[PDB]
Amino acid sequence: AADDVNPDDNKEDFAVLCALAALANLQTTVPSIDTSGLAAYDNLQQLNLSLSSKEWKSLFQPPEGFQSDPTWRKQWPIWVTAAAALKAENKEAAVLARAGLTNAPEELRNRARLALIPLLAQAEQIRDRLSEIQKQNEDTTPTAIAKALNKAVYGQDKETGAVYNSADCFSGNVADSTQNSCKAGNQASKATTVAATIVCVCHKKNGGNDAANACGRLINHQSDAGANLATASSDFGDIIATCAARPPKPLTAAYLDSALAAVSARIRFKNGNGYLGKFKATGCTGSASEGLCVEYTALTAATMQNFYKIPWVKEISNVAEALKRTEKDAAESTLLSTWLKASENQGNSVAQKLIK
Amino acid sequence: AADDVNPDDNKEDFAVLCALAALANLQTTVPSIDTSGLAAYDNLQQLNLSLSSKEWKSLFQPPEGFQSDPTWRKQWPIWVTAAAALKAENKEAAVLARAGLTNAPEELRNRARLALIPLLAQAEQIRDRLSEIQKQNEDTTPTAIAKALNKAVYGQDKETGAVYNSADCFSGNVADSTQNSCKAGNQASKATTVAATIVCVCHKKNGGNDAANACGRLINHQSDAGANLATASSDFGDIIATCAARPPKPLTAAYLDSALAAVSARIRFKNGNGYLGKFKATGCTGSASEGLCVEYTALTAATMQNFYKIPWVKEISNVAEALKRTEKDAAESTLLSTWLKASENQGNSVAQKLIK
Amino acid sequence: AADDVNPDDNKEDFAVLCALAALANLQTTVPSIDTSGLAAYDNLQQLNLSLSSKEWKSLFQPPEGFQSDPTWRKQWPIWVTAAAALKAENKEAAVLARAGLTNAPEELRNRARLALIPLLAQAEQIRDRLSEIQKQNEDTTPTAIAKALNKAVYGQDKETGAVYNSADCFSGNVADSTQNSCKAGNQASKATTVAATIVCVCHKKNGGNDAANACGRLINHQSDAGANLATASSDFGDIIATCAARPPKPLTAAYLDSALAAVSARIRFKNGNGYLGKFKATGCTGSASEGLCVEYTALTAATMQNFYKIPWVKEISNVAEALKRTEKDAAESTLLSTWLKASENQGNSVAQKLIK
Ligand SMILES: *[C@@H]1O[C@H](CO)[C@@H](O[C@@H]2O[C@H](CO)[C@@H](O[C@@H]3O[C@H](CO[C@H]4O[C@H](CO)[C@@H](O)[C@H](O)[C@@H]4O)[C@@H](O)[C@H](O)[C@@H]3O)[C@H](O)[C@H]2NC(C)=O)[C@H](O)[C@H]1NC(C)=O
Ligand SMILES: *[C@@H]1O[C@H](CO)[C@@H](O[C@@H]2O[C@H](CO)[C@@H](O[C@@H]3O[C@H](CO[C@H]4O[C@H](CO)[C@@H](O)[C@H](O)[C@@H]4O)[C@@H](O)[C@H](O)[C@@H]3O)[C@H](O)[C@H]2NC(C)=O)[C@H](O)[C@H]1NC(C)=O
Ligand SMILES: *[C@@H]1O[C@H](CO)[C@@H](O[C@@H]2O[C@H](CO)[C@@H](O[C@@H]3O[C@H](CO[C@H]4O[C@H](CO)[C@@H](O)[C@H](O)[C@@H]4O)[C@@H](O)[C@H](O)[C@@H]3O)[C@H](O)[C@H]2NC(C)=O)[C@H](O)[C@H]1NC(C)=O
Ligand SMILES: *[C@H]1O[C@H](CO)[C@@H](O)[C@H](O)[C@H]1O
Ligand SMILES: *[C@H]1O[C@H](CO)[C@@H](O)[C@H](O)[C@H]1O
Ligand SMILES: *[C@H]1O[C@H](CO)[C@@H](O)[C@H](O)[C@H]1O
Secondary structure, eight states: OTTSOOTTTTHHHHHHHHHHHTTTTOOOOOOOOOOHHHHHHHHHHHHHHHTSOHHHHHTOOOOTTTTTOHHHHHHHHHHHHHHHHHHSTTHHHHHHHHTTOTTOOHHHHHHHHHHHHHHHHHHHHHHHHHHHHHHHTTTOOHHHHHHHHHHHHHSOOSSSOOOOOHHHHTTTSOOSSHHHHTEESSTTOOOOSHHHHHHHHHOOOSSSSBOTTTTOTTOOOOSOOOSTTTTHHHHHHHHHTTBOOOOOSSOOHHHHHHHHHHHHTTOEEETTEEEEEEEOSSOSOSBTTTEEEEEETTOOGGGGGGGGGSHHHHHHHHHHHHHHHHHHHHHHHHHHHHHHHHHHHHHTTHHHHHHO | OTTSOOTTTTHHHHHHHHHHHTTTTOOOOOOOOOOHHHHHHHHHHHHHHHTSOHHHHHTOOOOTTTTTOHHHHHHHHHHHHHHHHHHSTTHHHHHHHHTTOTTOOHHHHHHHHHHHHHHHHHHHHHHHHHHHHHHHTTTOOHHHHHHHHHHHHHSOOSSSOOOOOHHHHTTTSOOSSHHHHTEESSTTOOOOSHHHHHHHHHOOOSSSSBOTTTTOTTOOOOSOOOSTTTTHHHHHHHHHTTBOOOOOSSOOHHHHHHHHHHHHTTOEEETTEEEEEEEOSSOSOSBTTTEEEEEETTOOGGGGGGGGGSHHHHHHHHHHHHHHHHHHHHHHHHHHHHHHHHHHHHHTTHHHHHHO | OTTSOOTTTTHHHHHHHHHHHTTTTOOOOOOOOOOHHHHHHHHHHHHHHHTSOHHHHHTOOOOTTTTTOHHHHHHHHHHHHHHHHHHSTTHHHHHHHHTTOTTOOHHHHHHHHHHHHHHHHHHHHHHHHHHHHHHHTTTOOHHHHHHHHHHHHHSOOSSSOOOOOHHHHTTTSOOSSHHHHTEESSTTOOOOSHHHHHHHHHOOOSSSSBOTTTTOTTOOOOSOOOSTTTTHHHHHHHHHTTBOOOOOSSOOHHHHHHHHHHHHTTOEEETTEEEEEEEOSSOSOSBTTTEEEEEETTOOGGGGGGGGGSHHHHHHHHHHHHHHHHHHHHHHHHHHHHHHHHHHHHHTTHHHHHHO
8 A cells, every 4th residue: 555645645746736826815026127217318308308499399299290200200209298397387497407507598508408419319229228128027017926826826817815716726617526627738627726736636535545644644634525526625725724835025937937847847657648646546536546646638748848838837937937027127127227317417417518 | 653753754854954054154155246347437536636727636524615515525535535546656647648648738638627527427326326236235245144044054153163052053052841942933932043953853862762764764873862952962963964965156045045935835734833844743852653843833824924033044034135135236236337447438538539 | 674765765866856857958048148239339330430531441450550559459350340341232321321421521520420439439348348248158059058968967968869878878888787887976987977867766677676666656667777787778768758847948057056956955975975865785786675876985075076076967067157157148238238229329319419
């Protein structure tokens, strides 16, 4: 009976699964896109507009004749936002004061505006990159991450309050038999969440000849999963009660990737299938002489990409891919913003040069 | 007796603990804040000062009348450092030569100085950010990290030479009983270091009915831990002798976070407490029929934050948080410095434009 | 016989080894050095050349008199590339059009060129840093990584098609005895690849009293490794057939470092040597009463650096060190390139200022 499923035989599998289950109902921060540079650029646009002729200001759709000019079409919303911001009480005075241009002669206003031309041209692509980053990463949010991870763990597309429910944990609820419920990657794939995987790898079936405590001796299996997982919820509660795992905060792509890699290194191939958990014979039925496992039906080395298409695996992968991008773009945005704030400071100094 | 504590029953716990114990007496490099930009900025300040009027130079506390001017108050130490540096033999000549301003006419000196105004204004916030980074990360040092990690592993706040000593490894030395010494997170928390955790999870008690080799069959337990851990040091020596772990270098936040996450995923909850190591009944006493473990008294899922307040856990967390910041700030500083060096090169070119 | 080598006794060692073996025949992307800034700089050089005098253009070795001028020596290839690019049909017209300098008066051409002086001087060190990064990281390629990792796993310095072959997996082929083949770090070091390590830790010897299934019960050992590993290949095939591991993509330094750290934390020291896999007595012979392991002969805590000199360990370390550098330099290059593109946009705006 060492070859049967005994207490602790799935203990090490359980540790990896526990780490994954701790991704449920997650409250993480995400890497911050530093968008302070956008305000700095807007401030420069407001200075430029303030220093413009009464004819140019009168303009604030581009007007007939420029409706089709590619520069006017791109700049219009930017100019419109600047004009609107400038209308606010004391805002133009403040803009001019910061620039050293309060009560400036017209000669100086014009020279100062012209001086801004290269500065604005240098800042434009920096600002446009920052605005692109912002847009590209706008779905990397704590909420979106939490929902995707709750789909992975519990099959529930919600930010919080996710709980074990077989209707969600197994795709279309539990099958007619445990053997069929504990299959994934196959034509009738059922064990499509981390929680279903835990049930398959750890449950105590009713009726005797069970593998109670396969996932650890500290589980208090107070009930059982019924026959054919009919009442898996009570048993899952007892199993998951033993899990204390917490992921690092903020959550990183690297951590998620390491967790998926850890699972992949535990799956074992036999007879044309892959298995997570102890498999002896027949199938993943919850019987001690058979197996307490997930059967990745027809999974093989050359078809391992199919593991990554299983819903929980795909959801976690999507989150990691989003975080991988956002981590880099956040670091880039720090510098873009600092540079734009520096351009704003430069624009505020040009009058000093020109007076002198 | 499979449910008793047998040889190897804590082997996998030991591997994770070994990785943590290898953080003792650590000699790591830390991410470098690239401060070369500060010198570049100083060089620009020296050029600006060199090109100033004899009246401005005569000034080198701001003088009566400017003592309260916010710009003079901020710039004074910078200007003072520039003036001091310029006094050094041949330094002003070298500054002027690099700028193409040796023997420059007064007209050109003045125009060149004015040209510097926007350049200096752009560089100022870049330099101030770099100086802020430097200050914010000045305690992320190999020494500070080593001391915090030695507190974590051995309870000894020192850079090197940390060793097992029960007076330090257990908070206030060992308790009256093993059961009480092998508790953490509770009103009389004792097992507050990684080394105490290893003792609790791995020791061979005297008097028979011990769990020798729970942490691995290659341990040569040549002695024992005494009764109630009275002579734990000799036994700890034999246990730790089997540990070969090395962390990656340079040490990273990610690695530390992964190690704490790995421990968290191993702690098992039963009867209102958490346990690391095999627990059967009664307590973590070192007796084979009872347990060889740490009891995280009253630890539960909803109170898991309390695990992170345990001294060794907090120390490692602090180190990881420091490294997480410094990794990012180091990457930012690379670009800040390159930009400041480029500004210096730009300042050295303005005379060529103005001559022509 | 719990102290003998039984089925599953090396299962956890095998999971870590499987993760390492999955580095064979790897197809990863590497962090991209963003070199778009180099083209941007070239465009600026072409604008500068276009705006130069017919005397300066006539020049396109520096000419007699400037052959030794440090500026001319550095700039010559850059200027030569610019002149060559400008000769291409319509290229000069396009350069001038982008700059607003089509049909520009000579006065404006000259003023515009002079305006470029500080811009080019600021861009020069940014471009030179980017070109340095490019050169420093030019061997961090998918091909080079794949070859080094195939040396690590299979001892075959090739990009793809690496397979088990004892002539390559063991240094100089298998030794006269398993005990001697399963040694590393010593005067006659043999087990110098991950695959040799797997053979040593997992093989089924012929002749009875073997430790079949030490690395897991799902292995179908259809044959055996012969006597003294004489036919290890067939047996290795059956063992590795059970391994499904995939590393994260793109491959990271952190992942590689974590994998080497994981192995280091598993090696156990006894009797002056280190061991990976279960060791009871005598040596790593494949006999159940002796050991199924690699013997790191004379490895000790103070000599653990010697583990990192073992060929597979060194190869993976080299890859991680290369990736660690390239990850950082890639992130730096993103900003260098954005800045150079912004300088190009600035250069294209100077005529607008000067006309006005
Ligand atoms: C900063 O404020 C400036 C105004 O003070 C903005 O300058 C305007 O910028 C656009 C380029 O996007 C130029 O558009 C060109 O216009 C000519 C035709 O110019 C004539 O008509 C306009 C409109 O009545 C008038 O403003 C001019 O003086 C001329 O009478 C076209 O042939 C080009 O294709 C292009 O459309 C404007 O000419 C220019 N105006 C002035 C007065 O400089 C500037 O864009 C602001 N900067 C930024 C970055 O937003
Ligand atoms: C580069 O070197 C310059 C000197 O060659 C520095 O310029 C000085 O910078 C401060 C701004 O921080 C200006 O302070 C203003 O001063 C006026 C009063 O100015 C009169 O008095 C000063 C002192 O006797 C004299 O230098 C001026 O010519 C005037 O006679 C105040 O009303 C302002 O609130 C502010 O305090 C200096 O005026 C300015 N001096 C000159 C000659 O330009 C410059 O700061 C250095 N750049 C950097 C970045 O450090
Ligand atoms: C942008 O294009 C410019 C040409 O339009 C390039 O300017 C040339 O740049 C080099 C600096 O690397 C200067 O070299 C100096 O030359 C003087 C001697 O100058 C006299 O002879 C040259 C050659 O016949 C002639 O071009 C000058 O007008 C003078 O008659 C030396 O004493 C210095 O040590 C140094 O060698 C050139 O003078 C300069 N030429 C002009 C016309 O400005 C410029 O380098 C290009 N920019 C970049 C970044 O590539
Ligand atoms: C588990 O239960 C099945 C179903 O009765 C039985 O066939 C096995 O022998 C038992 O271990
Ligand atoms: C460990 O030691 C205790 C104390 O004598 C005993 O109660 C247990 O039965 C033994 O295993
Ligand atoms: C493994 O094989 C060796 C060689 O015959 C023997 O000495 C051991 O007793 C056996 O377990």
